[PDB]
Amino acid sequence: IQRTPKIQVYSRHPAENGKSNFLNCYVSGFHPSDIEVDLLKNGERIEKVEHSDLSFSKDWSFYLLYYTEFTPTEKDEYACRVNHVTLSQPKIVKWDRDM
Amino acid sequence: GSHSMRYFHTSVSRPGRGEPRFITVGYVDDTLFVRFDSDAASPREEPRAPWIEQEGPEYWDRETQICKAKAQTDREDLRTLLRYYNQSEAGSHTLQNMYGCDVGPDGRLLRGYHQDAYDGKDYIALNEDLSSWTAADTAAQITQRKWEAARVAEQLRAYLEGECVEWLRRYLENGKETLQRADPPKTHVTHHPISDHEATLRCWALGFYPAEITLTWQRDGEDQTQDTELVETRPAGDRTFQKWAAVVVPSGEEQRYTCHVQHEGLPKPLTLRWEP
Amino acid sequence: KRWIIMGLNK
């Protein structure tokens, strides 16, 4: 069995341009556990990104939080790029500060 | 209120790339407090909450020994299950296990758990009686026969009714500052135009703990279950959680809509309306 | 506090 990841990209605190915050990509509901997750700034991979230890939900599907410190601006674009065996190509979800 | 302790374990084989990866984490309620990862440079059980740091080196050495032992039994079991399912040694396979206890406000055992899955599917579980097993298939029936012969259930019941409850009580006291504090959600309603004729109303709940929460939209007192987009509750990264619920509303009918928020940190369930 | 048991195999 294979289960494709759900993806949410969001900040720890409400986004205010020029104020330090954390950018989060929460991936969940997936199986198997092998997954590639990158945080992007203006299309390019962010280097220092940390993640939680693998755990799972009641239906056995896995979840992980990937995160990095960031200071958002008006211009800068952020995104989460996820690859998994269930995906024919990597899925990119853009950060929308209203979601 | 009621509380829980849970340990989660995952082993994932990787043929050609060394021994299976083993990761285990422990939670009290929605708070991570210990972890062990076989791929760490010097793998040890490590603290992940401040209230567990006070446990002495005997505790940490023993918890490390137990995790390492579980990693080993899982490695053995992955090989065994290849036989049970007539599978080749070429592929990656996954074993998962969760166990633990729920207690009520008085600290008595409400329910115990111990369940296993192979390749993301139920394999074998201890029943709620803590005395019998449910095996998912004929392979798992072999394990059931073995575990019945080794009186596994009796020992598990002893743990679940004893140490599990007793140490959960200990942790709840030592960590009472956080574990016994509910942080209520900070709530707001936002409005997002889609077109001339419609807009999105999004009801937010931020910074809450524990994760359990109910967010619902009503239109003139009626639940909009079918038309509400509800995102999965998500971690903020600082102990707390976030969630939102959204409805698409015909422009003009906004006031027929109210968002309702239930959280154990809320004395009265909340009623929110959109305000321009 | 983890459960301790010996050579529990499937």
Side-chain angles (χ1 to χ4, degrees):
Chain A
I1 53 101
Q2 295 183 342
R3 299 190 64 176
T4 196
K6 296 168 297 186
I7 304 166
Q8 297 197 62
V9 191
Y10 57 101
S11 47
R12 173 179 308 176
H13 302 282
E16 190 183 308
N17 297 333
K19 293 302 187 281
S20 194
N21 205 328
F22 280 86
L23 175 66
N24 290 329
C25 183
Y26 182 57
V27 291
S28 65
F30 61 97
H31 219 292
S33 65
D34 320 278
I35 194 160
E36 223 193 311
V37 178
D38 295 306
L39 294 190
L40 308 180
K41 179 180 182 185
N42 299 310
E44 300 301 319
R45 170 169 176 279
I46 298 181
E47 296 206 3
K48 300 196 160 189
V49 176
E50 298 191 276
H51 63 85
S52 61
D53 292 319
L54 188 66
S55 191
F56 54 85
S57 306
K58 303 171 61 171
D59 65 6
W60 305 107
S61 66
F62 294 102
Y63 63 87
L64 285 170
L65 177 65
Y66 283 76
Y67 58 100
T68 186
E69 189 152 48
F70 83 136
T71 295
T73 67
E74 174 179 44
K75 64 177 195 306
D76 288 329
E77 282 175 79
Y78 294 88
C80 183
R81 179 177 65 206
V82 178
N83 200 17
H84 190 253
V85 67
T86 57
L87 298 171
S88 34
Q89 81 185 272
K91 194 175 282 179
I92 286 175
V93 186
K94 300 184 253 213
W95 177 47
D96 183 338
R97 67 185 65 209
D98 289 314
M99 289 177 64
Chain B
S2 305
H3 298 274
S4 60
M5 183 167 69
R6 297 280 197 278
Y7 283 99
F8 300 86
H9 315 78
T10 306
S11 286
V12 184
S13 67
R14 40 187 172 188
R17 305 193 290 110
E19 290 303 317
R21 188 155 182 185
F22 177 74
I23 295 173
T24 176
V25 289
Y27 284 84
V28 171
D29 299 329
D30 299 323
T31 298
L32 173 76
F33 76 102
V34 287
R35 63 90 79 161
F36 174 104
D37 185 342
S38 69
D39 281 12
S42 289
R44 297 280 305 173
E45 194 91 342
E46 299 184 359
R48 286 295 186 271
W51 45 263
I52 200 66
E53 278 167 12
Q54 60 181 110
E55 300 298 339
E58 301 80 26
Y59 177 95
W60 296 105
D61 288 338
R62 198 190 112 163
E63 301 306 292
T64 295
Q65 149 189 351
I66 292 169
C67 290
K68 286 177 179 190
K70 176 70 177 157
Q72 183 57 38
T73 60
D74 273 10
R75 289 185 196 179
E76 291 158 357
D77 292 344
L78 283 164
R79 295 192 286 265
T80 296
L81 269 55
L82 290 179
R83 300 199 307 276
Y84 290 180
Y85 290 110
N86 311 122
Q87 294 169 327
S88 81
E89 294 167 331
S92 171
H93 298 274
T94 305
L95 268 170
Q96 289 162 276
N97 167 260
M98 183 206 67
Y99 67 81
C101 48
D102 294 345
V103 300
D106 53 6
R108 300 190 181 282
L109 180 66
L110 294 183
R111 173 167 192 174
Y113 305 84
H114 181 283
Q115 48 212 47
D116 287 89
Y118 181 59
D119 286 335
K121 295 181 61 173
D122 292 311
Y123 183 76
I124 196 177
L126 183 70
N127 292 326
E128 189 171 9
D129 60 15
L130 314 181
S131 55
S132 56
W133 305 94
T134 294
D137 60 30
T138 55
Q141 296 168 10
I142 300 183
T143 299
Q144 174 172 354
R145 191 166 64 251
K146 282 183 167 175
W147 284 5
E148 280 166 347
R151 293 306 205 166
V152 176
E154 288 91 336
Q155 298 174 253
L156 201 32
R157 176 184 169 186
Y159 165 79
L160 293 167
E161 293 182 331
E163 270 196 301
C164 188
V165 166
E166 290 156 10
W167 283 76
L168 174 50
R169 183 173 303 114
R170 174 199 186 101
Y171 298 152
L172 288 168
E173 171 67 20
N174 296 351
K176 62 181 169 196
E177 174 187 292
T178 44
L179 297 177
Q180 297 190 46
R181 183 182 86 242
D183 296 323
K186 298 159 192 201
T187 55
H188 65 105
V189 174
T190 53
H191 176 269
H192 312 274
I194 296 167
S195 71
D196 270 19
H197 339 108
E198 53 186 26
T200 298
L201 288 191
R202 183 162 289 117
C203 185
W204 297 82
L206 299 172
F208 58 92
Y209 180 96
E212 172 63 28
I213 198 173
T214 301
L215 294 186
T216 56
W217 273 107
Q218 285 172 21
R219 174 182 200 256
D220 292 313
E222 81 213 341
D223 286 341
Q224 293 310 99
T225 319
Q226 197 63 37
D227 279 290
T228 300
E229 181 183 9
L230 193 66
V231 292
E232 180 181 8
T233 297
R234 69 202 188 185
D238 63 355
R239 126 176 180 113
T240 73
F241 298 90
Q242 307 177 352
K243 198 184 187 65
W244 60 250
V247 284
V248 168
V249 306
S251 261
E253 307 186 7
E254 285 93 337
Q255 279 300 342
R256 290 156 84 170
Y257 295 81
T258 49
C259 177
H260 300 285
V261 189
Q262 298 184 352
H263 188 263
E264 77 164 76
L266 295 179
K268 264 66 173 288
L270 281 194
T271 287
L272 255 50
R273 285 185 182 276
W274 155 234
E275 321 169 54
Chain C
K1 187 70 150 39
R2 291 172 184 270
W3 175 40
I4 113 268
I5 191 170
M6 281 313 167
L8 177 67
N9 286 118
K10 288 182 174 65

